[PDB]
C-alpha cells in the first residue's frame, strides 16, 4: 500500500505464470523449428533443370 497499487498482487502472480508459459513456448518453438518440414526440406518438390517426370 506504501508504493504499490492494489492489483500489483495479481500482476506479479500473472507475470510469473506468463514467464513460465513463455519459457515453455520458446522451447516448443525451437523444437518444432528444428523438426519442421521447411528446415529439413520434406514434401517440397525441388524444381529440376530439365523437368523430368517419374
Partner 1 sequence: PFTPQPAPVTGNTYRTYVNDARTLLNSYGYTMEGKVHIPIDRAMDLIVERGLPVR
Ligand X SMILES: CCCCCCCCCCCCCCCCCC(=O)OC[C@H](C)OC(=O)CCCCCCCCCCCCCCCCC
Annotated binding site for heme c: 40, 54
3-state secondary structure (DSSP) of residue 26: helix
Q: Is 46 in the site for partner 1 (CB under 8 A)?
A: no
The footprint of ligand X on residues 27-46 (CB under 6 A) is: 27, 29-30, 33
Q: Cβ distance 41 to 35 under 8 Å?
A: no
Q: Cβ distance 28 to 34 under 8 Å?
A: no
Which of ligand X, partner 1, none interacts with 20 (beta carbon under 5 to 8 A by kind)?
none
Applying CB under 6 A, the residues found at the interface with ligand X are: 26-27, 29-30, 33
Amino acid at each position: 500500500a506504501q508504493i504499490f497499487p492494489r492489483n500489483a498482487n495479481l500482476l506479479s502472480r500473472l507475470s510469473i505464470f506468463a514467464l513460465v508459459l513463455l519459457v515453455v513456448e520458446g522451447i516448443l518453438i525451437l523444437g518444432v523449428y528444428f523438426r519442421s518440414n521447411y528446415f529439413r526440406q520434406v514434401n517440397v518438390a525441388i524444381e529440376q533443370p530439365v523437368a523430368f517426370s517419374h
